[PDB]
Structure formats: structure tokens, C-alpha cells
Design a protein around this ligand. Structure first.
Ligand SMILES: Cc1cc2ncccc2cc1Nc1ncc2c(n1)n([C@@H]1CNC[C@H]1F)c(=O)n2C
Length: 834
């Protein structure tokens, strides 16, 4: 390699936040074979992409325009304001006119080398797609904004330049376990449990005789299993556990080269806190000075009434468990089951993966996928096949195949969930890791989010940082030096600000309030960075369209919270931006922003589910991005306050609540009565939409402090790092805005109940998609969630197996529960914080 080729790898390590050219925490070469095996699909995608559309990354949608956005179109006319230097003129356009077709009409109504770019953003309107199919144009319609675009030169694709390049039973010898230290107080006991697993299913289990837990425990015991060597499926894990359950460690029995794992291994294990993705990891603990280590050794046509039972089994939810009777029925009528794509997760669960001949029969089954391949993509079904219950490479590949049909608009909606799904792959190089890699290198928008998602996990997950860092490096080596440049500027800014956030917290106390001495201390620290090595301009990580310029120090502050975060304001680095408004970012340390990311992503999916049934529930999924360990960025919502501060305005630090304050704050932050009516209108949909969503997600009972509202009536829920009770927040202040004064029906209450049940019914139509996203959220995002109890809440919330009116009743009852209590639960929320 070249001297400069090492400076490139050094840059990559600072970007990724982990050194992938590291061999200190491996007992094989799978990560090096994965860096090697990922050069091929990167090169093929870098080569197949059109440089022009790659540089301009048009954000497009093939979905139809909704009935609510059509009602905004007055006489089949859409106006675009085209700007140039100091002048501009409006253009009467048709929803089908492609960017080129309307550029030709601008040049006629009065050089042919300029493209259309949205003012202030790095967002372009290019390609053979109608204007109504550009997401920025749909955003302007929905929020009543005007379309502003500037006539300028298309970015040079030369900036996107990529740098050149046996029939015997299986047995295992347990030698012993060693730990450096353990306190001299409790004289405990210990044993080793070896499991052969595949898709969380335990094929076989052997334990050791229990010996006294000391700093070194030798057994020298051969543990013979019943499963023959040939019967071992690919992806089978040898899960070794220490119970007194304090420690665990996995080792793949079939390596990446299809070779059976043989020889001597001294594995550094993980410790338990106090089921989840972290438990399936092939990674070993990097902490060799403090961790426990086990040392092992390997020296090896159907009848009508049965059709009804089958069809009923196929018609159950993802969490309905399969009896042995059910699995035998599905396997025997294997070919009838194959005619129903909905039965695929259940049919592949019925397979006896520890039987070679039965796996071979399943592979024969998969070879007749005329029904599967010609079926409409069901993301819920496809995700169902990519969770912890599926470890077969070919079962997982039919699902990844179905994802290939997804447009970039939809890949963005499921990206964080698909990135977390890599945690369930037996091997580092997988069809899913390749699909993500390929889709990232193809769209800049997806590559940016892919970068931040992969980077959030590398920074706070030792269990999967090695794997994700190899996937990130493969992406980072194909995005091009324009993207590599932006990521560098973004990484520097977040690191400098993360140092300042952690320094400010230690200075004060989580027991006290912010002082003048802490705010002046922050201003002197920010002034030091600005005129020194703080990048001249960085791209907002949660809004890559925006380029934040220099800080606005005289408006930055330390928030009067308990996790003392930084409220930062930046100037816009685009002189073409239509407004002089700053870019506000909140920098916080002390909560898991990954849990907030996951909720906001479900909230965006729920918004698209309502978009299908022509429903706009006015949700405000704000920007939130996890940048490292318990730290990250959150969007500042302009002209917005909390429901608590509206209550403390009338009476401070209580307790005391009044029903009439929310409707008085709205009539105040309104210039005209027309704008005030629009606020009550926006509150009817945003309140209804948040009531529905928050209930379904089990995060319905929050303090009014974590619920904000904008000066334009837009109510929104915030801070999901958290999770007598209530289903959702419908306090008597919200109800007063809607014209109801407890046990009385007003026109806006009829409207709220109407949209509520219609939004609820609309979500119930995607029950399996919501169940599957939720169950995956709990395994890949929380400390630990029980695989049969914690999830069951969402089945009860979405009322599985009930008719469309008995469920309507259940939700209408939940409306009445929050009205009976009123402010009863809210008072307790203030006694709990004192
Ligand atoms: C959206 C958003 C979500 C968050 N989730 C978790 C943690 C912090 C968050 C901050 C957010 N952003 C925001 N923009 C503006 C604000 C604001 N919070 N606040 C309250 C102070 N921090 C908490 C806010 F209730 C205001 O008083 N103003 C003027």
C-alpha cells in the first residue's frame, strides 16, 4: 500500500469511530473475509450508478398524491417561484410537468445548462418524474408554504469521485472458566451450560456438574451432544452460559468458509445486567483485563376440514404460538402452505433445522417460488422473516429479495429497522448487509442516514461494533469524496460539542438549577471553538438538506433541565435561503436517544399508513439522531412551548391546573381570527393522531411536560427515552379547545372521535407490520425485554381477532377513561418529581 493509502484508512477510522484493520478481538478471519467479500458489491454499485442523478440525489415518490393534498390544488395549477441573483418570477405549472418540461417553458416565456434547486437546501428538482412526485413539492402543499427554487448549475459528478483501490454425535470439551476478580464476601456456586442453537431454537443442551465459583474453575469434561455432525445446520451457534446467569458467549459451529469449527478457543464472555439481540452475538468481549473467559476444545388434494385448520393457522398474528400439532400440519401440507405468502414465517418455523434431510426438503420447497416471487411486497411479512426466529441463509434471502422492489422513499422509512435486523444475521457478510450497502451507495440521502445509523451502533454497542464498522467502511469506500468530506465536517462538530456538553453537566449538579456563572462559562467555551478549528459549515445530521453555518453564541444556552443539555443556534450557510431564521440544535447527554429514534421512525411509518387511506393526522416527528454513547442531537422546534409551561404561566410550580389556559395561549399567538381557527383545526388532527399512536405504542401515559404545542395549534409528543394509570393524554385543557366541558358533546369533539377511530381502524389494517416493528424495537433497542410478555401489550392494544366495531368500542372507552380522571394522573406526576 501507499503512504497516502494509510492516511485514507486513518480518516476512515476517525469517521467510523472504530479500527476495522484490527485483529486483537478475533479468533478467526471473518471480519477480514467480510471487508474482502464486500469490495465486489460496492464496485458493482459504484459502477452502475448515474453520476448526475447521484450528485443531485432527487427525492422522489411513485405513490399517488393523497385526497387531502388534491383538495389543496385549486384549478389543477401549482405555482413555482424561480429565482436568479436578485430577481424572481412565478410560473403556472401542471402537476405532471417534469423539471425539464417547465424549464423549457421558463426559457420560452422571456443558458440551457442550469438545474432547479430548492432555496437554502441542497435539494434538487431533476429527472423524468412529475413535480407532484417530488417530496419537497408535497411538503410545501401540506404545510401551505410556497415553492422556492433558484436557477443554478448542476453539481459536478467529479465531486462524487471514489478513490481507486460425519455420522458421529457432536461433542465439546469444557476445560474451565477464569475471572480476574470477584469480591471476598459471598461464597457462591457455578455451572456451564452449552446449547446448540439455530434461530433461537435450542437443538440440544448439555450442562456441567456444579463446582465452587473461584477465580479459576477447571472441569476437563467432554460434553457429548445427541445431534450428529451432519445434522448441524449452517448458522448454528454453540451458546456457552455461566449460571449461579452471569455470563454468556457464542461461537458459530459452521464458519464463513462452510468449515466445521475445530481446535482450541479461549473466549472472553459478556456479563449480564439486572430476550434481546445482544445475546446472539458471535463477538467476544474486548475487555480482557476485567472479563471472564471459558476455554473449550473441538476435535470433530387435502380435505375440506383440514384446509380450514390450515387456513386458520395462517390467519393468526406473528406472536400467536405454534403448537406441535400446528407445526406438523404446516409441514405435511407444505405445498398448500407455499401457495400463501402470509404462511411463510409460520411454515419456516415448522422446519426441523437440526435435521439435514428436512432442511434439504425445505430447500426443495424454496425452489418453487412462483407464488412468492409474484406476490405483492408485504414489508411486515418480509421483516417477520428477518428477525431472531430465522437463521437460515436461504429463508433470510427470499425476504431480502422482496426488499429489492422497495423505492428509496420506503427504504428510508425502514432503514433503521433493517440496520438493527443485521444484529440477527448469523454471519457478518449477509444478503441484508449487502442490500443496505448497495442501497446506501445508490442514494446519497440513504447513505447519510445509513452512516449515522451504523455510527450510532458502533459507538455504543461492543456486541456489534466490529460487524457494523466493516459494513460502514465498505459504504465509506464508495460514497465519494464529496460525501466523505461532509461526514468529516459533521463528525468534528458533534465531537467538539459533545466535549462541551459533558463539561457543562459536571460543573453544576442534577439536584440544582442553571446559574449566570454556568451560562457565561458556556459562552466563553463556544467563543474559543468558533474562531479556531470548528468547521466553517456542516450538514445537519437529522436534515442533510440543511447546511448549518457559524454558531449564534448570543442565543446559545444551557437548558434548565436535569440532564443540562445545550440549546444551540446556528446561522444558515446558504445565502440563497428564503429566510433569515437560525438552525436550532439541542445537544443532550443522559438519555438513550436510540429509543427516541425508534419511536419517531414508527411514527413516520404510521403517518405513511394514514397517507394510504387519505388521512393527515398532523404528527410532528422531529429530528433526533444518536451520535454516540447516551448522547446525540435533537431538533429545535421554532415557535413551540410545552403544555406544562402554558399551565405554569397561570400558576407556577404546582400542582394547580386550569382548564382554560391552552385556548387562551392559542388566541394570543394568532394575528387574525382566521389563523386562530387554523390552530384549533391543526390541534384536532395532531391531538387525535397522537392519542391513537401513543396508545398503540404503549407509551400513552406521559406527563404534560413532555407534550409540546406550536403557536399554529400543532401538538406533538417529545422525549421517548422514558419507557392508577391512563391510556393517553386527553386532559380537560385539550377538551376545552374542542368545545367540550366534561360530559357534553361539541362539533369538534365529534370530529376528534371521528378521526380517532378512523386512524385507529387504518392502523389495525397493518397489525402484523406494527407488531413486528414493535417486537424488533424491544429486542434491538431496550436493556432487556421478555420474548413472550412485554410484546403481548401491542396485541391487546390493536385488539387482535376482534371485529371492526367491538375494537371501535374499546378505543371509545379509552377516550372516556382519560375524561373520568381528568387531571388525577397529572397531579401525581408532580408529586413523583418531588
Ligand atoms: C422536539 C424536542 C424533543 C426533545 N426530546 C427529548 C429531549 C429534548 C427535546 C427537545 C426538543 N425540542 C425543543 N425545541 C424547542 C423547545 C423545547 N424543545 N423546549 C423544551 C425544553 N427541552 C424539552 C422541551 F420540552 C422548549 O421550551 N422549547 C422552546
Amino acid at each position: 500500500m501507499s503512504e497516502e493509502s494509510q492516511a485514507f484508512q486513518r480518516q476512515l477510522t476517525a469517521l467510523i469511530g472504530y479500527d476495522v484493520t484490527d485483529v486483537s478481538n478475533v479468533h478467526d478471519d471473518e471480519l477480514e473475509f467480510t471487508r474482502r467479500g464486500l469490495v465486489t458489491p460496492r464496485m458493482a454499485e459504484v459502477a452502475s450508478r448515474d453520476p448526475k442523478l447521484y450528485a443531485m440525489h432527487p427525492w422522489v415518490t411513485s405513490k399517488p398524491l393523497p385526497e387531502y393534498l388534491w383538495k389543496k390544488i385549486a384549478n389543477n395549477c401549482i405555482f413555482i417561484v424561480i429565482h436568479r441573483s436578485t430577481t424572481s418570477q412565478t410560473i403556472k405549472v401542471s402537476p405532471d410537468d417534469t423539471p425539464g418540461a417547465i424549464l423549457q417553458s421558463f426559457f420560452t416565456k422571456m443558458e440551457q445548462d442550469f438545474v432547479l434547486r430548492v432555496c437554502g437546501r441542497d435539494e434538487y428538482l431533476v429527472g423524468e418524474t412529475p413535480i407532484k412526485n417530488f417530496q419537497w413539492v408535497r411538503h410545501c402543499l401540506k404545510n401551505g408554504e410556497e415553492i422556492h427554487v433558484v436557477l443554478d448549475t448542476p453539481p459536478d459528478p467529479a465531486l462524487d469521485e471514489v478513490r481507486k483501490e460425519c455420522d458421529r454425535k457432536f461433542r465439546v470439551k469444557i476445560r474451565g472458566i477464569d475471572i480476574p476478580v470477584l469480591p471476598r464476601n459471598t461464597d457462591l456456586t457455578v455451572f456451564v451450560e452449552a446449547n446448540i442453537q439455530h434461530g433461537q431454537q435450542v437443538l440440544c443442551q448439555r450442562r456441567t456438574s456444579p463446582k465452587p465459583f473461584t477465580e479459576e474453575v477447571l472441569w476437563n469434561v467432554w460434553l457429548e451432544f445427541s445431534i450428529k455432525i451432519k445434522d448441524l445446520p449452517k448458522g448454528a451457534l454453540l451458546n456457552l452460559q455461566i449460571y449461579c446467569l452471569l455470563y454468556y458467549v457464542n461461537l458459530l459451529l459452521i464458519d464463513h468458509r462452510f468449515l466445521l469449527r475445530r481446535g482450541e478457543y479461549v473466549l472472553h464472555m459478556w456479563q449480564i445486567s439486572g430476550f434481546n439481540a445482544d445475546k446472539l452475538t458471535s463477538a467476544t468481549n474486548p475487555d480482557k483485563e476485567n472479563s471472564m473467559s471459558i476455554s473449550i476444545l473441538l476435535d470433530n388434494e387435502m380435505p375440506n376440514q383440514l384446509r380450514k385448520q390450515l387456513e386458520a393457522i395462517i390467519a393468526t398474528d406473528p406472536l400467536n404460538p405454534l403448537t406441535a400439532e400446528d407445526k406438523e400440519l404446516l409441514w405435511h401440507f407444505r405445498y398448500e402452505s407455499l401457495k400463501h405468502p402470509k404462511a411463510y414465517p409460520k411454515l419456516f418455523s415448522s422446519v426441523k433445522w437440526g435435521q439435514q434431510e428436512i432442511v434439504a426438503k425445505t430447500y426443495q420447497l424454496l425452489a418453487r417460488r412462483e407464488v412468492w416471487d409474484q406476490s405483492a411486497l408485504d414489508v411486515g411479512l418480509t421483516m417477520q422473516l428477518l428477525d431472531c426466529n430465522f437463521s437460515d441463509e436461504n429463508v433470510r434471502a427470499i425476504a431480502v429479495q422482496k426488499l429489492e422492489s422497495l423505492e428509496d422513499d420506503d427504504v428510508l422509512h425502514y432503514l433503521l429497522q433493517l440496520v438493527q435486523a443485521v444484529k440477527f444475521e448469523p454471519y457478518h457478510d449477509s444478503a441484508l448487509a449487502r442490500f443496505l450497502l448497495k442501497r446506501g451507495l445508490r442514494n446519497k440521502r440513504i447513505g447519510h442516514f445509513l452512516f449515522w445509523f451504523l455510527r450510532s451502533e458502533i459507538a455504543q454497542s461492543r456486541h456489534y461494533q466490529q460487524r457494523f464498522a466493516v459494513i460502514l467502511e465498505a459504504y465509506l469506500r464508495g460514497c465519494g469524496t464529496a460525501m466523505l468530506h461532509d461526514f468529516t465536517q459533521q463528525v468534528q462538530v458533534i465531537e467538539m460539542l459533545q466535549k462541551v456538553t459533558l463539561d457543562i453537566k459536571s460543573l453544576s449538579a442534577e439536584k440544582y438549577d442553571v446559574s449566570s456563572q454556568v451560562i457565561s462559562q458556556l459562552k466563553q467555551k463556544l467563543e474559543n471553538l468558533q474562531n479556531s478549528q470548528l468547521p466553517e459549515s456542516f450538514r445537519v445530521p437529522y436534515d442533510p438538506g440543511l447546511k448549518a453555518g457559524a454558531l449564534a453564541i448570543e442565543k446559545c444556552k444551557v437548558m434548565a433541565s436535569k440532564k443540562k443539555p445545550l440549546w444551540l443556534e446556528f446561522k444558515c450557510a446558504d445565502p440563497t435561503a428564503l429566510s433569515n431564521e437560525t438552525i436550532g440544535i439541542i445537544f443532550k447527554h443522559g438519555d438513550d436517544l436510540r429509543q427516541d429514534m425508534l419511536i419517531l421512525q414508527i411514527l413516520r411509518i404510521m403517518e405513511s399508513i394514514w397517507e394510504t387511506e387519505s388521512l393527515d393526522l398532523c404528527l410532528l416527528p422531529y429530528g433526533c439522531i444518536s451520535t454516540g454513547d447516551k448522547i446525540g442531537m435533537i431538533e429545535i422546534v421554532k415557535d413551540a412551548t410545552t403544555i406544562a409551561k402554558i399551565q405554569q404561566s397561570t400558576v407556577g410550580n404546582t400542582g394547580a391546573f386550569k382548564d382554560e389556559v391552552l385556548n387562551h395561549w392559542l388566541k394570543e399567538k394568532s394575528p387574525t381570527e382566521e389563523k386562530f381557527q387554523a390552530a384549533v383545526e391543526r390541534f384536532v388532527y395532531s391531538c387525535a393522531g397522537y392519542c391513537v399512536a401513543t396508545f398503540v405504542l404503549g407509551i400513552g401515559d406521559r406527563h404534560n411536560d413532555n407534550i409540546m404545542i406550536t403557536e399554529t395549534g400543532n401538538l406533538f409528543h417529545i422525549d421517548f427515552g422514558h419507557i392508577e394509570r391512563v391510556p393517553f393524554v386527553l386532559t380537560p385543557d385539550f377538551l376545552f379547545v374542542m368545545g367540550t366541558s366534561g360530559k357534553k358533546t361539541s362539533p369538534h369533539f365529534q370530529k376528534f372521535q371521528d378521526i380517532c377511530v378512523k386512524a385507529y381502524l387504518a392502523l389495525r389494517h397493518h397489525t402484523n407490520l406494527l407488531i413486528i416493528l414493535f417486537s424488533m424495537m424491544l429486542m434491538t433497542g431496550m436493556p432487556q425485554l421478555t420474548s413472550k410478555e412485554d410484546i403481548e401489550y401491542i396485541r391487546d392494544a390493536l385488539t387482535v381477532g376482534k371485529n371492526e366495531e367491538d375494537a371501535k368500542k374499546y378505543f371509545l372507552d379509552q377516550i372516556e377513561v382519560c375524561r373520568d380522571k381528568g387531571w388525577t394522573v397529572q397531579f401525581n406526576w408532580f408529586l413523583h418529581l418531588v
